[PDB]
Amino acid sequence: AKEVEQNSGPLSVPEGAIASLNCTYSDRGSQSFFWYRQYSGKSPELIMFIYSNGDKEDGRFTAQLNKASQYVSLLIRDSQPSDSATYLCAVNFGGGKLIFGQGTELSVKPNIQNPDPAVYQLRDSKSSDKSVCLFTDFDSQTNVSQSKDSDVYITDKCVLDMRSMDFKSNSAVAWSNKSDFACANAFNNSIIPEDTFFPSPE
Amino acid sequence: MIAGITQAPTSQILAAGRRMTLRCTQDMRHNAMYWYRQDLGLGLRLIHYSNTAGTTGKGEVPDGYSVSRANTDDFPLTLASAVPSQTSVYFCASSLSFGTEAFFGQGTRLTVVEDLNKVFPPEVAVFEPSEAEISHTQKATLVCLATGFYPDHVELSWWVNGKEVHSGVCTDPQPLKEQPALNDSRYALSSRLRVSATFWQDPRNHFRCQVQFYGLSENDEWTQDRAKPVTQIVSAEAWGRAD
Ligand SMILES: [Li+]
Numbered sequence: 001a002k003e004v005e006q007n008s009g010p011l012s013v014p015e016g017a018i019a020s021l022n023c024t025y026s027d028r029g030s031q032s033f034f035w036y037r038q039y040s041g042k043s044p045e046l047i048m049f050i051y052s053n054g055d056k057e058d059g060r061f062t063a064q065l066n067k068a069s070q071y072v073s074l075l076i077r078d079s080q081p082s083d084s085a086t087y088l089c090a091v092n093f094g095g096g097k098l099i100f101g102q103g104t105e106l107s108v109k110p111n112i113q114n115p116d117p118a119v120y121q122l123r124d125s126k127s128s129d130k131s132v133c134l135f136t137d138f139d140s141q142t143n144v145s146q147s148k149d150s151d152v153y154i155t156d157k158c159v160l161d162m163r164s165m166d167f168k169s170n171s172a173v174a175w176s177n178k179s180d181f182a183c184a185n186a187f188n189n190s191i192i193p194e195d196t197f198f199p200s201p202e
Numbered sequence: 203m204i205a206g207i208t209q210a211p212t213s214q215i216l217a218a219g220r221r222m223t224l225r226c227t228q229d230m231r232h233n234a235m236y237w238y239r240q241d242l243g244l245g246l247r248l249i250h251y252s253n254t255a256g257t258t259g260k261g262e263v264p265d266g267y268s269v270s271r272a273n274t275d276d277f278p279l280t281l282a283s284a285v286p287s288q289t290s291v292y293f294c295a296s297s298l299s300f301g302t303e304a305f306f307g308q309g310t311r312l313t314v315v316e317d318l319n320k321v322f323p324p325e326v327a328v329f330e331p332s333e334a335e336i337s338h339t340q341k342a343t344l345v346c347l348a349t350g351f352y353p354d355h356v357e358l359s360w361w362v363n364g365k366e367v368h369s370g371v372c373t374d375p376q377p378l379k380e381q382p383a384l385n386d387s388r389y390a391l392s393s394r395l396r397v398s399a400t401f402w403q404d405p406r407n408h409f410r411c412q413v414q415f416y417g418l419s420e421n422d423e424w425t426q427d428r429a430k431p432v433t434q435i436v437s438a439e440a441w442g443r444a445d
Contacts, residue, residue, distance in 0.1 A: 001245050002262065008243070032301055040375040041357070043293065043306035044246070088246065092301050096253035097261065098236055102245030120332035122345055125440035132329045132345050134394070150381065155392050158372035162341075162396060171372070173345055173392045199334035 004091045006101035013108050014140075019076040023089030023101050026070075032092035033065055033072045038103065039085045048074060079108045081159055081168060109140035110159055110168040117142075119187045121201040131201070133183035135192065136171040144172040145191055152176045152186050204229050209294050209307040213355050213416035213433070215321060216284045216314045224279040224310050226294030234297045235277035236304065237261075237269065239290040246293065252277055253300040284314045289353075311416065313353040318422070320386045321431045323415045324351040326438040331402055342402035344440065346411030349390040350380070355416035360395045363408050370396045407442035 003026040013019040021035075032051045036044035048063040050056050050072065056063045062075040072091075076083055089101035117138040124130040135144070138157075147154040154174045161168050174186035184198065192198075207228040216222050226235065233254045238246040238261075248261030252271040266288060268280045277296075281288055291311055295304040315321065327349075331342035348356060354377045360367050373393035381387040393411065401407055417431040424430040 001247065006245070008245075034304075043309055045306070046303050049303070090304070096234070096251050096257075096259055096300055097248060098234075098251065098295075098297075098304060099248060099262070100238070100246040102243070116339065118335070118338065120335045120343075122329040122332045122343075125328045125330045126438065128327075130327060130329075132347065132392075134332070134335070134343055134345060136335075136343060137339070150383065153378055153380070153390055155374050155378065156376075158374065158394070160370055160372040160394055160396055162370040164369065165398070169396070171343065171394055173347075173394070175347065197338065199332075199338075202333060 001100060001102045003093065004089055004099045004101045006089050006104050008102055008104065010105040010107050013079050013106065015079060015081060015108055015110050017079055019079045019083065019106055019108065021074045021076075021087045021104050021106065022071055023073070024071045025089075025091045027067070029094035030067070030091050031094065033063075034090040034092075035061075035063060035074045036088040036090060036100075037085050038088060044088055076106075081108045081110045081161065083108045084159075110170070112137075112139045112168070112170065115139040116197065117193050117195070118197040118199075119183055119192065120199065121183050123201070130175075132173055132175040133186055134171060134173055135187045137169050138193065140170060142170065142193065143191075147174075147186065149185075151178050152181065154186050206230065207294060207296050207305055207307040209292070209310050211310060212308060213311045214313075215318075215353065215355075215418060216281075216312065217318055218284055218286060218314055218316045220284050222281040222284055222312070224292055224294075224312070226277045226279070226307055227275050228296045229275065230296065230298070230305075231274060232296035232298050232305075233274065234300045234302075235271070236295040237267070237277065237279045238293045238295065239263065240293060241290050249279065286314050286316065289313045311355050313355065315353065317386070318418070319426050320352055321417060322350055322352045322388055323417060323431050323434055324348040324356060324413050324436050326411060326413050326436045328409065328411050328438045328440045330440055330443070336399045336402070340399045341396055342399050343394050343396040344409055346393045346395070346438065347390060348392075348413045348436070350388045351377075351390075351415060352386070352388045354389050356391060357414040358391060358393050359412050359414075360393065361410040361412060362395075367395065402442055403444050404442045405444060408439065409441075410437055410439040412437045
């Protein structure tokens with residue numbers, strides 16, 4: 001990516017809203033324009049192609065090419081959390097090169113219906129001294145910061161979808177093998193909102 | 203009935219300085235073939251391309267790699283002397299002709315290591331839903347942790363009563379470093395599976411988190427006390443509990 005350029009993002013879009021992705025390119029020899037979608041740990045798959053100036057519509061996707069202004073764009077109407085992926089602009093150049101942009105990660109944030117932020121402590125199913133902390137049920141604007149202590153591990157948040165209950169929720173996990181660790185040492189006031197339900201494990 | 207595009211191997215750990223050829227074959231009679239590497243800041247960068255049998259060209263990052271195109275079917279990528287900066291995810295793609303839709307293979311995770319006994323399989327543990335969650339929400343989240351692995355060549359899946367589930371699952375997109383000050387740090391990855399409290403409460407329900415690790419091949423030499431860190435599956439499991 002140097003003849004084809006994109007912002008890396010991540011771009012954050014509320015569910016239902018229009019997601020807009022843009023890509024620019026060098027005008028010498030550019031023939032055809034592609035949008036690829038790449039899910040995490042998967043391969044890029046073609047969603048749209050365009051070669052003449054104007055709009056092209058396919059379902060919720062709209063591609064727009066303006067060769068004079070040297071951009072190409074993709075609009076995603078009615079965006080769903082399952083649209084969260086990396087979107088890759090690709091351009092065909094004369095002589096054989098298919099050049100990709102750096103990709104824009106789109107995160108489509110679920111509207112959390114009933115935020116119920118909580119941190120729960122879970123025990124290992126196997127006989128051990130081990131537990132993990134689960135921060136869950138928080139709203140989608142919550143930022144989960146990286147640990148500031150080497151031996152305390154804190155994940156980023158992810159969205160799970162219980163499809164048959166029509167229920168989405170956010171969570172992040174923390175754990176530590178430090179002798180004096182409490183879940184609160186990881187999910188502290190820099191992360192958890194006011195009135196987080198933080199029950200003592202029994 | 204066509205196999206489509208296939209890359210081989212699917213994973214490789216290489217000692218630095220060794221020669222390596224990544225293979226890509228397609229049975230679609232496609233004329234144009236491409237090799238890309240993908241790295242977290244950089245997106246997909248074209249290494250070499252071949253618009254047609256017998257013609258290859260340099261892409262954006264050709265240094266340290268070569269290709270040939272003796273046949274329509276195949277496009278091999280060769281690393282003459284592997285260096286750590288060649289650690290990447292490699293994608294081969296093909297299109298019918300120059301300019302048509304590119305179809306990508308599955309990708310090859312290649313890690314080039316200076317030291318082979320930095321390589322470790324994951325340990326895997328499942329953590330049972332907390333009673334306070336079950337009481338507060340009538341839902342029950344299980345957590346799987348894969349820890350202590352190097353390099354980051356893992357695939358985590360959940361299996362409920364012998365069948366893979368995707369609903370109510372999310373897994374971290376990137377593993378985290380257990381010791382980020384060390385540039386050879388082992389990794390950890392977590393995943394959740396959330397079910398209704400009544401599903402978790404049924405002692406007939408079996409939950410398994412399975413981690414496929416890609417390690418050293420059967421060819422590679424091993425001299426340490428610990429087991430050879432081969433390509434392997436490590437699992438952990440829990441049964442449902444009424445109480
Ligand atoms: Li909030």
